[PDB]
Amino acid sequence: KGAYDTGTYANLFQRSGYREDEIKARLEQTWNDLFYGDEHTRIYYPVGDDKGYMLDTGNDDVRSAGMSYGMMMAVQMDKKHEFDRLWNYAYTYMQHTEGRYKDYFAWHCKPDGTRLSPGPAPDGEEFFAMALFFASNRWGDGPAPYDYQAQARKILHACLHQGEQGEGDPMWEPSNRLIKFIPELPFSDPSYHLPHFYELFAQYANEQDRTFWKEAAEASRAYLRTACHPVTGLSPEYANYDGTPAPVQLHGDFRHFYSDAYRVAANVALDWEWFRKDPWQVQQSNRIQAFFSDIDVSDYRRYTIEGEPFNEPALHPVGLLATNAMASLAADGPDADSFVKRFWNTPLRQGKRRYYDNCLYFFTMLALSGNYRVYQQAAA
Ligand SMILES: OC[C@@H]1O[C@@H](O[C@H]2[C@H](O[C@@H]3CO[C@@H](O[C@@H]4CO[C@@H](O)[C@H](O)[C@H]4O)[C@H](O)[C@H]3O)OC[C@@H](O)[C@@H]2O)[C@H](O)[C@H]1O
Structure with a gap:
């Protein structure tokens, strides 16, 4: 049963050997920097x-x-x-x-x-x-x-x-x-x-x-299950109702793995943590972590959903690392603890492109600390 049924949320940071006090301070500091930090860091x-x-x-x-x-x-x-x-x-x-x-x-x-x-x-x-x-x-x-x-x-x-x-x-x-x-x-x-x-x-x-x-x-x-590539775990930004990449639009080519699609791995992993209904979510999480296991954050590109890299870099590589790490809520493969530590060791992004990276980062900091929770209709 999921965290919804049990009320117990996985603390992946604690499972990785980080201290409860360390984790609470890190989440508070992420909040302080994102909402009230300097002019190169904050987004609120x-x-x-x-x-x-x-x-x-x-x-x-x-x-x-x-x-x-x-x-x-x-x-x-x-x-x-x-x-x-x-x-x-x-x-x-x-x-x-x-x-x-x-x-x-x-x-x-x-x-x-x-x-x-x-x-x-x-x-x-x-x-x-x-x-x-x-x-x-x-x-x-x-x-x-x-x-x-x-x-x-x-x-x-x-x-x-x-x-x-x-x-x-x-x-x-x-x-x-x-x-x-x-x-x-x-x-x-x-x-x-x-x-x-x-x-x-x-x-x-x-x-x-x-x-x-x-x-x-x-x-x-x-x-x-139809939208994520069955080998790579990569999804397109825009997809038809049948899961296949949508046609090229007037405003751009959304057929590839880029900014929007990063959230899919995070969404899949949080549904698994909360509800634990679809075991495919474990395999999806394993596949995307396997794809990125030996790719450094500094080399993140646009990819075809088949996994072919572009010269073009990822616009939001910290965001992509954040979502790959949040997939550790569901992944049980050999990369799960590595992504948790890579994420811990990554600071908030700075400069003009930071917003999307830092929103994904915060959700991952919440989820991996066991603080992305269901607030139920419940007794005092
Ligand atoms: O300027 C980008 C915009 O994409 C199309 O926007 C849609 C609009 O979708 C929102 C687009 O922004 C998404 O979030 C962005 C993800 O990429 C990041 O780099 C960026 O910082 C984020 O803001 C957001 O999730 C979507 O809600 O939804 C309404 C549609 O009418 C609009 O077309 C625009 O054509 C294109 O300019």
Whole structure:
């Protein structure tokens, strides 16, 4: 049974020989540096008395994915002040109040809250909902807009039912229960598949949707088995519903193993840790660690999912190392302890491209310390 059933979370750092005091201080220091560090390290910026944003340093914008990541980090670290500031920013500037995207979030804005595009990013919505449910379960609902579980159910209502009552499209395809890349297009992004979050939506969402969420959890586990290469464990950034790489798009070639796809190994490993349902997740984790076992972080490239390297380097090599190390939650092969130590010995990334690397790094620091947990509807 998983950590959801047992309440016991694997501490991979402790299993590797790091001291409990050492591990707690390292996680606290990662939080301090990421949220409140120097101008070359931090990715969180408070705004006035009641707002704050996660900055995509590389693109000079604020992204729904980043805001939702920050909320998950804050609720996992018991940081309600930062949680509330981030949520108020997303609620105030990004959430649509009308039209085809009502209750969805404009996927990016300028730091000052000016929307740059109206379209939403489903990976943002699902993290907002999961972080808000955990906020409700840890702290209790406050007055709107800090009525966390009510806000979460509103987001997930739109995710399944948008355009039943006028203009818009859902973020899940009703026929296959798979999350989409964007509401309008008939293909997916493997990194967006969070079956472990859908298991929990099946407990917390509007009652009429709980069967759908349970089905989505199983459909996403099956989908990832079709999307990850059976030899390398590599997945494409964009994939068809059948798991094969999607066609080249106007805005780029997403057929290869690059930034988005790094999260798949981390998502697979956390579902295994929480729920322990699909033993394939152990083999997927072993395969990707085997692929990268003798590749130094300094040599990380773009790869075809068949494992053929490009000259082109990885944009976010620290992020890739982070996700390869988080796969140690499920891997039982000869590389698992090596990746945990490689990760421990890697500092937070600095400079203009740091944001994505450091979000993945933080989730890995949470998970490998046994601090990436389910906050259940439970007794005092
Ligand atoms: O500017 C990049 C953008 O990709 C397409 O964006 C989608 C949009 O997806 C979000 C894209 O950003 C993802 O996260 C990035 C991963 O790579 C990192 O280098 C970067 O720092 C991260 O921000 C995020 O996960 C997605 O939610 O979703 C809405 C779509 O309308 C939009 O098309 C844009 O075409 C391309 O410019």
